[PDB]
Amino acid sequence: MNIFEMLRIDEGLRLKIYKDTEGYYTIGIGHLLTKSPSLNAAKSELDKAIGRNCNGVITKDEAEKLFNQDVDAAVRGILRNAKLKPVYDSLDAVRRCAAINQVFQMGETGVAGFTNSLRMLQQKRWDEAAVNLAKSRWYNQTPNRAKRVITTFRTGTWDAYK
Ligand SMILES: O=[N+]([O-])c1cccs1
């Protein structure tokens, strides 16, 4: 297991534009295209991202290329965020994957309300952090995925992903 295999499990792979769990146009391995309800706007974003006229469809190689960029950008973002970097750097590599997973799904803005969880993670109070993480819109809206990510934060193992 690694971050790519983990997010591949959580996000799936679809080669045609689909709506994510929040109803937003997405493609590939959870590549958010736009929050716009206009499918044409999503298609424009897709063509811009891939560099050709896709007509709402991409290849597996193209999906994987976006995924690489997205994972990379998530990490680089975390490192530029003054609230996140100290916590991220305090973690072992497995728990860092859980951090990347959460940011990939929710964005840095999504993690803004997680101040108390973040402190508990930095303190390595793993069971307490796990309890706090579940008191969230995130957990309520995507409980099976959040449970996997939280188990990863709690244990620093890949037990939830087998
Ligand atoms: O950067 N971090 O240690 C993070 C943990 C959870 C969301 S981001």
From Swiss-Prot:
Recorded consequence of changing G30A: Almost complete loss of enzymatic activity
One cellular component term (GO) for this entry is: host cell cytoplasm
* Record bears the keyword Hydrolase: yes
User: What effect on the protein does mutating D20 to E/Q have, as reported in its record?
Assistant: Loss of 99% of enzymatic activity
**Molecular function terms from GO:** lysozyme activity
Instruction: Describe the pH profile of activity.
Output: Optimum pH is 7.3.
What's the impact of mutating S117I? 500-fold decrease in enzymatic activity
Q: Where in the cell is it found?
A: Host cytoplasm
Tell me, in one coarse class, where this protein mainly resides. host cell
Inducing or repressing factors: Expressed late in the viral replication.
**Catalytic residues as annotated in Swiss-Prot or TrEMBL:** E11, D20
Q: Where does substrate bind?
A: L32, F104, S117, N132
Which chemical reaction does it catalyze? Answer: Hydrolysis of (1->4)-beta-linkages between N-acetylmuramic acid and N-acetyl-D-glucosamine residues in a peptidoglycan and between N-acetyl-D-glucosamine residues in chitodextrins
Keywords, comma-separated and alphabetical: Antimicrobial, Bacteriolytic enzyme, Cytolysis, Glycosidase, Host cell lysis by virus, Host cytoplasm, Hydrolase, Viral release from host cell
Outcome of substituting S117F? 10-fold decrease in enzymatic activity
The domain of life is: Viruses
InterPro entries hit by this protein = Endolysin_T4_type, Glyco_hydro_24, Lysozyme-like_dom_sf, Lysozyme_dom_sf, Phage_lysozyme-like, T4-type_lysozyme
Keyword Hydrolase assigned to the entry: answer is yes
Residues crossing the lipid bilayer are none
HAMAP family from the UniProt entry:
ENDOLYSIN_T4
Its biological purpose: Endolysin with lysozyme activity that degrades host peptidoglycans and participates with the holin and spanin proteins in the sequential events which lead to the programmed host cell lysis releasing the mature viral particles. Once the holin has permeabilized the host cell membrane, the endolysin can reach the periplasm and break down the peptidoglycan layer.
Name this polypeptide is given? Endolysin
Gene that specifies this protein: E
